[PDB]
Amino acid sequence: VLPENMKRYMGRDAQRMNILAGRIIAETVRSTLGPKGMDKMLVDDLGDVVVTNDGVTILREMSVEHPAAKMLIEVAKTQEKEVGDGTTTAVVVAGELLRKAEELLDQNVHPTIVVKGYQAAAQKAQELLKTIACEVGAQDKEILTKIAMTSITGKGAEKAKEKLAEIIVEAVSAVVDDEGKVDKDLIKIEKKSGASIDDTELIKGVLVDKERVSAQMPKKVTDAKIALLNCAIEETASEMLKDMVAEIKASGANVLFCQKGIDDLAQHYLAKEGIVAARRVKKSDMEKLAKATGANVITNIKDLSAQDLGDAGLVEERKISGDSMIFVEECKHPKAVTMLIRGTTEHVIEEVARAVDDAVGVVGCTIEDGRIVSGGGSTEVELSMKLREYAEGISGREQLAVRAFADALEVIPRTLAENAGLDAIEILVKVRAAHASNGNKCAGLNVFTGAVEDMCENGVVEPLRVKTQAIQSAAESTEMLLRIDDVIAAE
Amino acid sequence: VLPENMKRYMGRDAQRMNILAGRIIAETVRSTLGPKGMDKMLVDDLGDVVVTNDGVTILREMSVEHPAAKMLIEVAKTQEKEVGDGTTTAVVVAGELLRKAEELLDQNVHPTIVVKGYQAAAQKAQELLKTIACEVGAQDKEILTKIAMTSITGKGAEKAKEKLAEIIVEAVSAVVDDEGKVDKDLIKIEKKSGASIDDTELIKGVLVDKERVSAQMPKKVTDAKIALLNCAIEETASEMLKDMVAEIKASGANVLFCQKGIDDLAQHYLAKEGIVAARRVKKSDMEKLAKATGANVITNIKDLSAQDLGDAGLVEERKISGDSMIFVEECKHPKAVTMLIRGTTEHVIEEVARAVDDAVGVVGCTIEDGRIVSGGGSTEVELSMKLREYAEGISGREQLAVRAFADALEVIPRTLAENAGLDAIEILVKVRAAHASNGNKCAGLNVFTGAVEDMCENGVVEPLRVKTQAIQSAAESTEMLLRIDDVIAAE
Structure with a gap:
C-alpha cells in the first residue's frame, strides 16, 4: 500500500533498534562522564575544531538517523534549557533503563507494566530527592562557590575553579535582583x-x-x-x-x-x-x-x-x-x-567561555531554587536502596520494572568508578553499606581518594533541579519509547 | 547512527594520529631552526615564489588536514600575535612533548596525570625564567641592538644586521612615545x-x-x-x-x-x-x-x-x-x-622586508617589557636541570610527566646542534655541566665556535616574553590534545 522509499520497523526489531539506538548514544557520551573522563573533538564540514565533554553539544553537532536517538536528544535539550547541567549524566542512565527494559518485554511483561513500574519508581524517586534535598541560602557565598566549582571540575579550566567561582558568583548574585529569577x-x-x-x-x-x-x-x-x-x-x-x-x-x-x-x-x-x-x-x-x-x-x-x-x-x-x-x-x-x-x-x-556559561547557569539555579543534593553518586545510592524497598510495597508485575529501575540508576556510580580507574564492584560494596548506615550527607565516592567519603562535607554538591528534572524527562522518554511497536518513516 | 561521509578516530588511533600530526609539523619546520638551518620555498597556486624560514608563515601557507596539526598552528599564530618571534622554536618542542607524552599513556599513566605533570612543570618553568630573567633598560641602545641582531641572524640579510639594528632601534624607540606601548x-x-x-x-x-x-x-x-x-x-x-x-x-x-x-x-x-x-x-x-x-x-x-x-x-x-x-x-x-x-x-x-618587520617586533617587545633571557639554549638547560630536581619534589605518578617535560625541552638544544653540524651528545655533556656550575649568563652553545660559551656576554639574548609565552601556549595545547580520545569530523 505504501510508496516505494518509505521504510518501516515493527515488533522486536523496532524495539531492538530503538533500544540499541538510545544505547549507542549513552555509550558514546559516558566516556566524558566523570572527573577522570576524557574529552571529544567535534569537527564540522569546514574543518572547525571544537573541544568539549558536553553530551548535549555532542548530540547537537552529530547528525542522528534513528528516531529513538532523536528522542533521547530531546531529553538532553530539555535538560539543557531547564537546568543547563546534568546533560551527559541524564543520557547515560536513560540508555541503561532502555537496555534493561527490553529484557522485561522479552520476559513477557507488557510495555504498559514496565511503564507503570518506571512511572511509580520515578514518582517516588522525586519524593526521595525532596526528602534528602538540602535547603541552603539562595545567595550564600560559600555554597554558591561549591556549586560553581563542582560544575567546573572535569575540565582543563578547573585549575582556576576558585577564581572562576568567585567571578561567576559575584556576577550572578548582582544581576539576580529580586527573589527571584536571573537573566543570563x-x-x-x-x-x-x-x-x-x-x-x-x-x-x-x-x-x-x-x-x-x-x-x-x-x-x-x-x-x-x-x-x-x-x-x-x-x-x-x-x-x-x-x-x-x-x-x-x-x-x-x-x-x-x-x-x-x-x-x-x-x-x-x-x-x-x-x-x-x-x-x-x-x-x-x-x-x-x-x-x-x-x-x-x-x-x-x-x-x-x-x-x-x-x-x-x-x-x-x-x-x-x-x-x-x-x-x-x-x-x-x-x-x-x-x-x-x-x-x-x-x-x-x-x-x-563554555565552562563559565554553565557556571552562571548552575549558580543561577541554586539562587532561584535554594535546594541542592549531595553528589558523588550518594543520591543515586539513596534511590537504589529506597526503590528496592518500595518495589516490595509495589508488588504484582510492576515490581519487576521498579526493581530494574532502581538497579538502572546504579549505572552512573558504576561508570564514574570505571573512568576513575576503580573497581565498581568493591566501590559499591563499601559505598552502599556506608551510605545506608551513615546517611546521605555522609557518603558517595571520592574518585580522587579512591574510597567512599562525605561528598557533602567535601563540598561535592549539585542543584536539586539537576537530579529531579533528569528523572522526569528521562523517565517519560523511555516510557514513551517502550510504547512504540511500529515506526513508519518517509524518505 | 552517523551519516555516510562523517569520519571518526578514537582511542590510541586518535591519539596516535594526533601525536603524529603535530610531530610531522615539528619535524618539517625544525629544519630551518638555527643559524646553520636552511630556508623553504613556498609557491602558491599561481606560481608566486616565497622564500622564508618562519614556521608560522609556512604553517599559514600550507593546507593542513588533521585537527591536531591545526591546534599546533593556533599556538604558532598566538606566538606570532603576542610576541612575533619564537615561532619556529615553539612548534618543535611541542612536537617532542607530544612524542613522549604518548609513551606515558602507553605506560598506563592517565592523560590527566600527564596533564598535571606538564601543568606543574610549566608553572615552575615560568618562575624559573622569571628567576633568571635579566632586567635591562627599556630604551637602552646597546641591548636593543643585541635583541635586534640576534633576531636578524640565520637570514641572508644578517650581513647587515648592524645597519638594520640601528635602523629599527632608531625607528621604534621614537614611535614608542610613553612608557609604554609601541604601535608598529x-x-x-x-x-x-x-x-x-x-x-x-x-x-x-x-x-x-x-x-x-x-x-x-x-x-x-x-x-x-x-x-x-x-x-x-x-x-x-x-x-x-x-x-x-x-x-x-x-x-x-x-x-x-x-x-x-x-x-x-x-x-x-x-x-x-x-x-x-x-x-x-x-x-x-x-x-x-x-x-x-x-x-x-x-x-x-x-x-x-x-x-x-x-x-x-x-x-x-x-x-x-x-x-x-x-x-x-x-x-x-x-x-x-x-x-x-x-x-x-x-x-x-x-x-x-619580512626580517625587519620582525626586528621592529622584538625591539618593541624589549622596550615594552624590560626583561630578556640568555639564548643559545642556556635557559632550556636551566629548566631541564631545575625541573629534574622539582620532579623529585613532585613525586607520585606526576613526576614521570614532569621528568619527561624537562627532557622534552632539550630537543631544542639538540636540533640546534644537529643543524650546526655538532654532536648533540658531546655538546650536552659539556654545556649542561658548564651551565650548572658557571650559571645562566655564563653558558649556552656557540654554534659558531662549536663549543659552550657565554651567550649573554656574546650578546646572544632574546626577550623574556619569547620563552615564557612559548611555554604557556604550547603546554596548554599539548595538554588539551592529550585530553581528546575521540574526534568526529563531518565532510
Whole structure:
C-alpha cells in the first residue's frame, strides 16, 4: 500500500533498534562522564575544531538517523534549557533503563507494566530527592562557590575553579535582583586570547569590541555622558549633518554609540566638539550599554535630549591581544556586567567561555531554587536502596520494572568508578553499606581518594533541579519509547 | 547512527594520529631552526615564489588536514600575535612533548596525570625564567641592538644586521612615545629593488609611491603646507571646480594629497596656483601623512582652512629603481617614519622586508617589557636541570610527566646542534655541566665556535616574553590534545 522509499520497523526489531539506538548514544557520551573522563573533538564540514565533554553539544553537532536517538536528544535539550547541567549524566542512565527494559518485554511483561513500574519508581524517586534535598541560602557565598566549582571540575579550566567561582558568583548574585529569577543575558561572556585562565576578570560594566572612530577623538573619558542612537549619523548637506552633532553636544553627551554608520563629515564634527564615538554598534551592544549606563535608547537623533543620556564613570579604549575594545565602567546603576575570558589559545578561551556559561547557569539555579543534593553518586545510592524497598510495597508485575529501575540508576556510580580507574564492584560494596548506615550527607565516592567519603562535607554538591528534572524527562522518554511497536518513516 | 561521509578516530588511533600530526609539523619546520638551518620555498597556486624560514608563515601557507596539526598552528599564530618571534622554536618542542607524552599513556599513566605533570612543570618553568630573567633598560641602545641582531641572524640579510639594528632601534624607540606601548603601524615597511641591503635607509617622515599629477607642478617644495582631502576634486562647472582649488590656495596649502581623483581641469587650476598634487591616495597614506605633518584630515573641501594644514620641511619627488615616489620629510612633529628596504632582487627586498618587520617586533617587545633571557639554549638547560630536581619534589605518578617535560625541552638544544653540524651528545655533556656550575649568563652553545660559551656576554639574548609565552601556549595545547580520545569530523 505504501510508496516505494518509505521504510518501516515493527515488533522486536523496532524495539531492538530503538533500544540499541538510545544505547549507542549513552555509550558514546559516558566516556566524558566523570572527573577522570576524557574529552571529544567535534569537527564540522569546514574543518572547525571544537573541544568539549558536553553530551548535549555532542548530540547537537552529530547528525542522528534513528528516531529513538532523536528522542533521547530531546531529553538532553530539555535538560539543557531547564537546568543547563546534568546533560551527559541524564543520557547515560536513560540508555541503561532502555537496555534493561527490553529484557522485561522479552520476559513477557507488557510495555504498559514496565511503564507503570518506571512511572511509580520515578514518582517516588522525586519524593526521595525532596526528602534528602538540602535547603541552603539562595545567595550564600560559600555554597554558591561549591556549586560553581563542582560544575567546573572535569575540565582543563578547573585549575582556576576558585577564581572562576568567585567571578561567576559575584556576577550572578548582582544581576539576580529580586527573589527571584536571573537573566543570563545580563552577564556577557567575552573571550580574547592572551594571559591565562587565572587572568579572566569581571568588569562591572560593558566591554564592547569597538574602537575610537577618529584619531582626533579622546581615548579616555571620565564622568562620561553616553548617548545611544540607532539612526545613522548621515544627513544630506553639512548644515543638517552638523545639526545632528550639535544636538549631541547640546545634550551634554560626549560619548556616542551609533548602531548604524557615521559619515566621515559627522566623525569630523564629533571630533571637533570633543565627542568620542563608535559606529556600526551591534543592537545587543546598544542594549547592554543602555542597561549599564541607564542611557535611553533614542531612535531619532533630533529626539535626543540631555535627560536621555546614560552615565559611566570611565569609558576607555584598551587593547587586549592587540584588539582595541571599549570599557564602559563605573556606571551609576549598571544592570549588566561583562566577564572577559583569558587564556593562552583560542580553543582554551573557547572551552573556558563554555565552562563559565554553565557556571552562571548552575549558580543561577541554586539562587532561584535554594535546594541542592549531595553528589558523588550518594543520591543515586539513596534511590537504589529506597526503590528496592518500595518495589516490595509495589508488588504484582510492576515490581519487576521498579526493581530494574532502581538497579538502572546504579549505572552512573558504576561508570564514574570505571573512568576513575576503580573497581565498581568493591566501590559499591563499601559505598552502599556506608551510605545506608551513615546517611546521605555522609557518603558517595571520592574518585580522587579512591574510597567512599562525605561528598557533602567535601563540598561535592549539585542543584536539586539537576537530579529531579533528569528523572522526569528521562523517565517519560523511555516510557514513551517502550510504547512504540511500529515506526513508519518517509524518505 | 552517523551519516555516510562523517569520519571518526578514537582511542590510541586518535591519539596516535594526533601525536603524529603535530610531530610531522615539528619535524618539517625544525629544519630551518638555527643559524646553520636552511630556508623553504613556498609557491602558491599561481606560481608566486616565497622564500622564508618562519614556521608560522609556512604553517599559514600550507593546507593542513588533521585537527591536531591545526591546534599546533593556533599556538604558532598566538606566538606570532603576542610576541612575533619564537615561532619556529615553539612548534618543535611541542612536537617532542607530544612524542613522549604518548609513551606515558602507553605506560598506563592517565592523560590527566600527564596533564598535571606538564601543568606543574610549566608553572615552575615560568618562575624559573622569571628567576633568571635579566632586567635591562627599556630604551637602552646597546641591548636593543643585541635583541635586534640576534633576531636578524640565520637570514641572508644578517650581513647587515648592524645597519638594520640601528635602523629599527632608531625607528621604534621614537614611535614608542610613553612608557609604554609601541604601535608598529608608525613604522612603514617599504621595499624597492635597487642598491643592496646595507643601502636600506630610514626616513623620519612618510614615503609614498605617488608622483606629480601634472608636468607643470613643482617637483620640490620647501616649507611645505600639506592639505589632506578625502573628497575628490571634481565639481560640475569650472567656477565651482575652481572654487575648490581657490580654497586650497587661500588656506596657504601648496601640497595637496587627495584620497580620491582630481579632474584634469582641477589639475590645471592646481598647477596654475603653483600647487603640487597627487590623486587616488591610499587611505593608509592619507593617515600616515596626517600623523607625519600633523595635517588635519578634511572631508569636505569647503571645510579646509589654514589651521588644518600640516607642515613638512621638504616634500620632493625622487626616483627609486625608476619609480617616482614622494618623500614628505622634516615635518615639525612626525609621529610616523618610513623604512625603505633596498636590495639586488625582488625576493631579497621581500625577505628583508619580512626580517625587519620582525626586528621592529622584538625591539618593541624589549622596550615594552624590560626583561630578556640568555639564548643559545642556556635557559632550556636551566629548566631541564631545575625541573629534574622539582620532579623529585613532585613525586607520585606526576613526576614521570614532569621528568619527561624537562627532557622534552632539550630537543631544542639538540636540533640546534644537529643543524650546526655538532654532536648533540658531546655538546650536552659539556654545556649542561658548564651551565650548572658557571650559571645562566655564563653558558649556552656557540654554534659558531662549536663549543659552550657565554651567550649573554656574546650578546646572544632574546626577550623574556619569547620563552615564557612559548611555554604557556604550547603546554596548554599539548595538554588539551592529550585530553581528546575521540574526534568526529563531518565532510
